[PDB]
Design a protein that fits this description.
The PDB classes it as hydrolase. The protein is of the alpha+beta class and about 270 residues long. It contains ten helices and ten strands. One chloride ion binds next to loops. The site of one chloride ion has 3 residues, from loops.
């Protein structure tokens, strides 16, 4: 269709403004049509990987190994300094938090210490990786927690995904494929109750649009930003849903240009829905 040719051409033009490695995957969830750009290429996930982490944790809740109300005793030693951590900022001497609260801090606020606490609770990155692969999500790797990612610039590239692999997870979240209704509802709740990335998926969508998403961001080193990502499920006015993954990687352009790629592509798909 000329409608989809125009959409595809505009995705390419928007992506080109990042002058980098751009991956896009979208699906109209109820109908099943998809569009991709570099959909099988590999991209650093950064904090997008807190989504597969959360699925692995909630799977253990469903299986009876964990409980959302179980108390996590967080010591000062587990709260690494320097790293982004609303938990540490509020509880610099440690605290007790319910598992549901650690999950909310990790997914909704991207807490790096919450992330590493959750990885440790489920058996580490190796456990989460094999669990995700067991779901049939092959084109993803989870090798490093946040502490290890901070140790050297290159480590983030070992936690990679293709746009389609992240799309797979979004489709599975949308349909409740991996999690009980209660655990899946909770995951969607915490993915919706975030204020991160207002200029990404949300940048040019109506402010009251419902968007369940997770951002990922690297620092900028030698002018290169490894990752500027957003992935989520958008509810359209007609009640149907779009799954949208945009990874902007390995570019020297500034933050406004990088985030604008995500925002403009997302609004393009919103406007292209009928
Ligand atoms: Cl680990
Ligand atoms: Cl895959
Ligand atoms: Cl390095
Ligand atoms: Cl600039």
């Amino acid at each position: 269709s000329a409608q989809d040719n125009n959409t595809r051409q505009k995705v390419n033009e928007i992506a080109a403004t990042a002058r980098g490695h751009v991956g896009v995957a979208m699906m109209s969830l109820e109908n099943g049509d998809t569009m991709t750009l570099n959909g099988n290429d590999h991209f650093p996930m950064q904090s997008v990987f807190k989504v597969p982490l959360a699925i692995a944790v909630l799977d253990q809740v469903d299986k009876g190994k964990l409980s959302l109300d179980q108390v996590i005793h967080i010591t000062k030693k587990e709260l690494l300094p320097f790293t982004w951590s609303p938990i540490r900022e509020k509880y610099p001497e440690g605290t007790d938090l319910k598992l549901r609260e650690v999950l909310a801090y990790t997914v909704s606020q991207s807490d790096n210490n919450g992330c590493d606490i959750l990885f440790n609770l489920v058996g580490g990155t190796a456990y989460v990786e094999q669990y995700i692969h067991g779901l049939g999500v092959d084109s993803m790797a989870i090798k490093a927690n946040e502490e290890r990612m901070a140790s050297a610039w290159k480590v983030q590239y070992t936690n990679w995904s293709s746009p389609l692999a992240t799309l797979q997870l979004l489709k599975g979240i949308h349909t409740g494929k991996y999690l009980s209704k209660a655990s899946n509802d909770f995951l969607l709740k915490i993915m919706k109750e975030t204020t991160t990335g207002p200029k990404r998926l949300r940048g040019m969508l109506p402010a009251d649009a419902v968007v369940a998403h997770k951002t990922g961001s690297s620092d900028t080193k030698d002018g290169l930003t490894a990752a500027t990502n957003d992935a989520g499920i958008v509810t359209l006015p007609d009640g149907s849903h779009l799954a949208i993954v945009v990874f902007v990687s390995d570019t020297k352009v500034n933050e406004a240009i990088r985030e604008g790629v995500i925002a403009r592509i997302t609004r393009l798909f919103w406007d292209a829905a009928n």
